[PDB]
Amino acid sequence: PIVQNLQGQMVHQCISPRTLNAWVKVVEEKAFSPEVIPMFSALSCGATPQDLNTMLNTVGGHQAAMQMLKETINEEAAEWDRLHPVIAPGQMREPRGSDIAGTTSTLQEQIGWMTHNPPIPVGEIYKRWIILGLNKIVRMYSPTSILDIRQGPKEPFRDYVDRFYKTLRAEQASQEVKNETLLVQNANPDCKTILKALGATLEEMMTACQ
Amino acid sequence: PIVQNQGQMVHQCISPRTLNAWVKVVEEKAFSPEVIPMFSALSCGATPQDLNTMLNTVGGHQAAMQMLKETINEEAAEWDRLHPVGPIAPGQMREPRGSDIAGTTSTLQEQIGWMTHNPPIPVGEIYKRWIILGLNKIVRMYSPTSILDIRQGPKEPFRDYVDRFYKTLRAEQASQEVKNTETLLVQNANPDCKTILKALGATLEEMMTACQ
Amino acid sequence: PIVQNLQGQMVHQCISPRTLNAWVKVVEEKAFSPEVIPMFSALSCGATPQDLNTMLNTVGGHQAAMQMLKETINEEAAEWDRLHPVIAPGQMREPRGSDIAGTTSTLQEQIGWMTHNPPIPVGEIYKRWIILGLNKIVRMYSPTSILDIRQGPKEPFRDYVDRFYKTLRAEQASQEVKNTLLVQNANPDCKTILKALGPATLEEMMTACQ
Amino acid sequence: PIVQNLQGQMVHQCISPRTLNAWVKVVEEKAFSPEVIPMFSALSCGATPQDLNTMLNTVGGHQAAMQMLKETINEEAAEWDRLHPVIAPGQMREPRGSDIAGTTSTLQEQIGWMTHNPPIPVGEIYKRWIILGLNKIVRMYSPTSILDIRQGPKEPFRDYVDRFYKTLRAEQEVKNTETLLVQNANPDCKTILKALGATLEEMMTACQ
Amino acid sequence: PIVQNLQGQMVHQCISPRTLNAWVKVVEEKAFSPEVIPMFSALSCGATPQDLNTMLNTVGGHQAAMQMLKETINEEAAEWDRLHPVGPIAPGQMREPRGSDIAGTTSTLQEQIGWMTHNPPIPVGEIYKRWIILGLNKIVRMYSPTSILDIRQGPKEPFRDYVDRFYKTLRAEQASQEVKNTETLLVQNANPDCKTILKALGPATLEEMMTACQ
Amino acid sequence: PIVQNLQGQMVHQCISPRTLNAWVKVVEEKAFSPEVIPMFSALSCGATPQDLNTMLNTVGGHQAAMQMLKETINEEAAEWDRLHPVHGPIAPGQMREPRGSDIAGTTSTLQEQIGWMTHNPPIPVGEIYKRWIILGLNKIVRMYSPTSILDIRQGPKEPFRDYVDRFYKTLRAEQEVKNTETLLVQNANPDCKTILKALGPATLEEMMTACQ
């Protein structure tokens, strides 16, 4: 990553083993559950594109997902190249899409762009792209539609809701589309009665159905 | 988080140690009360971004986490009432709205600016306050039993009963005036103990010795 | 905690996850075995009262013990307030009992008191109180009286002694009061052997009975 | 490794136990699965040739692979010696192939070359060679040809693809994908896939 | 412990949790096997007497051993007090430590640091450590199950195993390494088949004896 | 060990618990498999002779091996004393030449050891002693090696790769004399030996493909 020495300067560090291991475990244990994204994002704090490639490369298995991911990166790099078409000796060049994915850039270039003032945050840009791709995967790997999350007849409301919102987190839509109407619909009769009786916070709905 | 290098205050990444610690806490302890202090400790120094990171890494408990978002909305709206916010002065640092504190509408730089500025606007600590509010409501929610239903089993050692009593009591939300203890504790004691305890006019230490 | 930067200044750090986890494990694994006290004391090296509260709060279960602990803290804070009753703008105020327990003080105050020269070691004072309470608990949680630690007829002396001293460690009295019963409670075969020596090191007694 | 002190200077550190253990575990758990290469590369960030030797030496087992590896290093060192044939008192000498593998160089030389301006990145060069050898091994240890990765008749497309690309990784103009993937798909899917002109996302939706 | 800041000065740190845990595990896993001593010594690198007390206090169980240990410390502190007797101290100045100051009983942490970091150092940490290690040796011998005399090579026991037992057992026992000075009782206690073979060589390296009996 | 402070100076550190534990585990898990040597060498990066003694002392069990090791150290210290005999009473203040036993950390203090190592030019007593220990560790590894390379014959149902793995593992335990693809072919089973003999004495890669 790039991080700040107790002096003041911004310097390149290696990825820790702690971070490497953390990432592999995440992927091993949690597949492409949604909470992988924030965990990836956190574990890639400071990351150069090189570090992001390292991280993705250490993922074995899920190679369909990872090819899908490469496709999503191609799309976003091509779009970057549309919006910013691209040389002076000594000076620092503008990065193409493929420079951001760390394909055509060297580490030094990547550091140059990131630590320059103002920064070209190629790490953060590539990360944005990877996270796009990771969302598409998470939805892909999502087993069940939110429509098929119905409260079991002997299912405590809380459990149902847990499933509801877990499932909902996996899917991709405007948070307008994601914004407690299907929650009530899919509730079981006993609860739906109780919930329909109110005009309500989730806290209220969960108390009411407890 | 924000922490101290030399002498200057600087942004660090969240450690993997901290991330893992938080996930484990939530995996192992659900929303047992001791999650709150553990969250608070593990979020020492945290920017709102770090707090979001932490909450995002929680998979499962998504009902709780939506409940949490609601509690944050309530407190942000109230913040916006108490501190209304033009085009800001160029260069200068703007007043944060509620949603800036939850790290929704602020950038990391803004968040750092507010926290490290002198005097500090401790957006990290404010958001943390809100999250902890929400976490308490959840802990009460996830609490299975009312303190009224904590009755000493007929073959239950007093100490165990008390452990349950106070564990259960910790889960519930009220002024410690309302929680103020050694009245329902005695009531709910089993006969053998209730006799012994009623005999005294007493510390918990004394009650536990007496019933041992 | 408060600890020293490689420069020289005394500065506040967060509690490490390592320390948090260490403390929880201690309590999970060892309950209120006596060796919890020194382990708590070590893990609270440098601690502000805030850190001490954090640590105690992370203990789930043993809530009877922890209420008992709060009572012991009340006693000692009230006594502090007896011995030291009692504001100037800018200046640093004298801490009441409840300021030491971190109830009524802010972190800044706590740091102020501790890092001031001369120090008001509120961390160390509160720690003293907590350790008082922890001793009362350890005695409480102690199953057996030292009087009831009798060497089994087929029990190796060393085991007996191990039990003896473990049990003895749990109980609360001046080490004058703890400073005879080891020999008394020994089984006949050993008691003969031990009585044969002139009121002897433990090493000697354990060799003699081996 | 060679890494940067909070001051600013470049200095030699020992390999951490964390790194050593990490590497051994990788090799124990993942054998010569492809993701070992990037994991080796990451864990050898900063490495002197000495550190690279250390790392390879700590691998017990897979001694066939490791001899194969030595052969690949010989080839690349000999080639280095062809392309750069090879002292002034005080001054720093040009490294032969065997100096890069850390066989004939001392640690000091290795540091000298790496930290000199401009750098002679013997660490990175040797690493390049090791990674060459590691690829040959990964292909060796690969059980199945991409030709023999056929979608089972009751195999979900995603699983098939996972196998396809895992297998493909073990073996990029030549690797260039959405031609043998379709060929080897089972009938039901091949129909559906042939119907499109397509991203993998699209193909996987279509076959789901 | 006392350790050196990246500047240059010597400063007190807390004991790490890593160190605490390490010590407890050692004692849990390895009891009073001999390799506990060097492990204690290593884990107590830099230690103040306070840190040494902390470490010993975190040991639960083995309380017989730990009382034995206290006795050994009393003996050595009393002897210290004989060899270095100690008025009201000069104001400001640093006092001579009694035995009980070295065990961290009567000294404060500040005193302990003062003694250790002063030039020349009074290495109270290292002295107390010396005492603890004395006591730990007596314990290790105590907890040692078998005498070296009773380590006889089994009739179907490979020599190497026998030797492993021999020297493990020998390590547990306390005498001058003159008294421990090896390849005499090792041969005696060897089983017949080996004793023949070993006696055939002229009083030989251990390597040679182990090859010969393989 | 001796290592470099982020300033620039060379300073003594304690051995980490991480390093101690690492070493013990290595020895527990891997006995005297050959890869213990490089692992020891790595874990003893920076080591004073004191640190090397610490490390060896923490090894319980394998006490035969460890006595064998002491013998190997005696041999090499005596030889050191032959090649470098020691000067009267030493110059006051000045740093003395180390005898063999000073290098094994038997007769030297830590300060002396640091003095020798950090002096310019360095007397690398750590590295010298390490050399000796590694000599002894090799003799042990060969000792603890169960099988001769001659007795590594490819099983009739043994995949070549496995055979080779055994071959070279075994060979590592025991480089002109070690120089290889001659006994490897000899000891191959008939089916493979045919195939391998067909190629003109070939890389190992080629031999392993051919026999796969």
Ligand SMILES: COc1ccc(-n2c([C@H](Cc3cc(F)cc(F)c3)NC(=O)CN3CCN(S(=O)(=O)c4ccc(N)cc4)CC3=O)nc3ccccc3c2=O)cc1
């Ligand atoms: C498409 O965007 C890309 C493509 C490549 C990289 N890239 C990479 C990426 C990082 C990566 C990993 C992922 F899991 C998912 C991602 F999205 C990104 N790794 C690789 O490409 C390595 N790698 C080899 C090729 N194949 S394959 O199966 O044989 C194959 C062959 C042909 C076709 N058509 C399809 C697949 C698998 C594979 O992994 N590694 C770098 C390492 C060192 C320096 C540079 C790079 C760099 O640039 C980065 C982004």
Ligand SMILES: COc1ccc(-n2c([C@H](Cc3cc(F)cc(F)c3)NC(=O)CN3CCN(S(=O)(=O)c4ccc(N)cc4)CC3=O)nc3ccccc3c2=O)cc1
């Ligand atoms: C309610 O206040 C908020 C709202 C959003 C955030 N927020 C967040 C928060 C952090 C968070 C996590 C919690 F578990 C609980 C909390 F209270 C806070 N997480 C997310 O938004 C991620 N996320 C996706 C959306 N849903 S959902 O189920 O599809 C869904 C969709 C619509 C409706 N109406 C209900 C549910 C689940 C989910 O998590 N992550 C950020 C990351 C990067 C920058 C910014 C942010 C930021 O702003 C923070 C506080």
Ligand SMILES: COc1ccc(-n2c([C@H](Cc3cc(F)cc(F)c3)NC(=O)CN3CCN(S(=O)(=O)c4ccc(N)cc4)CC3=O)nc3ccccc3c2=O)cc1
């Ligand atoms: C008794 O002295 C005290 C009392 C409270 C605190 N204190 C604390 C303490 C620290 C603590 C934890 C212990 F396990 C044991 C201890 F002795 C000390 N914790 C709490 O107050 C948290 N907490 C909630 C209340 N109860 S209860 O069961 O509902 C309950 C209900 C009715 C009655 N009458 C009594 C108790 C349990 C509980 O835990 N946490 C702080 C955090 C942030 C800033 C400040 C504080 C601060 O001041 C510290 C010392």
Ligand SMILES: COc1ccc(-n2c([C@H](Cc3cc(F)cc(F)c3)NC(=O)CN3CCN(S(=O)(=O)c4ccc(N)cc4)CC3=O)nc3ccccc3c2=O)cc1
């Ligand atoms: C081939 O290129 C080389 C050759 C040697 C080294 N090298 C090394 C290498 C590192 C290494 C490890 C690998 F797994 C794979 C690699 F490719 C590279 N390790 C060793 O040499 C150790 N080692 C000895 C030789 N054999 S063997 O079985 O006896 C043998 C003998 C004859 C024949 N024909 C076949 C096999 C096994 C063995 O392991 N260790 C160093 C350590 C200290 C300083 C220097 C060195 C250095 O130079 C490095 C690269």
Ligand SMILES: COc1ccc(-n2c([C@H](Cc3cc(F)cc(F)c3)NC(=O)CN3CCN(S(=O)(=O)c4ccc(N)cc4)CC3=O)nc3ccccc3c2=O)cc1
């Ligand atoms: C004998 O020399 C000593 C005596 C006491 C200490 N000492 C200590 C020592 C350190 C220690 C631990 C060991 F495992 C072994 C050692 F050798 C040394 N620990 C204790 O005192 C704790 N402790 C309490 C007393 N008993 S007991 O069973 O009730 C008991 C009762 C009656 C009789 N006659 C004998 C024992 C058990 C016990 O454990 N802890 C300090 C902590 C804070 C500041 C100071 C001290 C300090 O000075 C250090 C050395």
Ligand SMILES: COc1ccc(-n2c([C@H](Cc3cc(F)cc(F)c3)NC(=O)CN3CCN(S(=O)(=O)c4ccc(N)cc4)CC3=O)nc3ccccc3c2=O)cc1
């Ligand atoms: C021969 O070279 C030596 C001899 C001794 C040391 N040495 C040591 C060495 C380090 C060491 C460990 C090894 F596993 C193997 C090695 F080769 C080297 N350790 C010991 O001496 C510890 N130790 C105790 C004695 N015995 S025994 O079985 O009772 C015994 C008694 C008599 C006879 N004849 C045979 C065996 C076993 C034992 O273990 N520890 C130091 C620690 C503190 C300061 C100094 C020293 C120092 O000098 C170092 C090198």
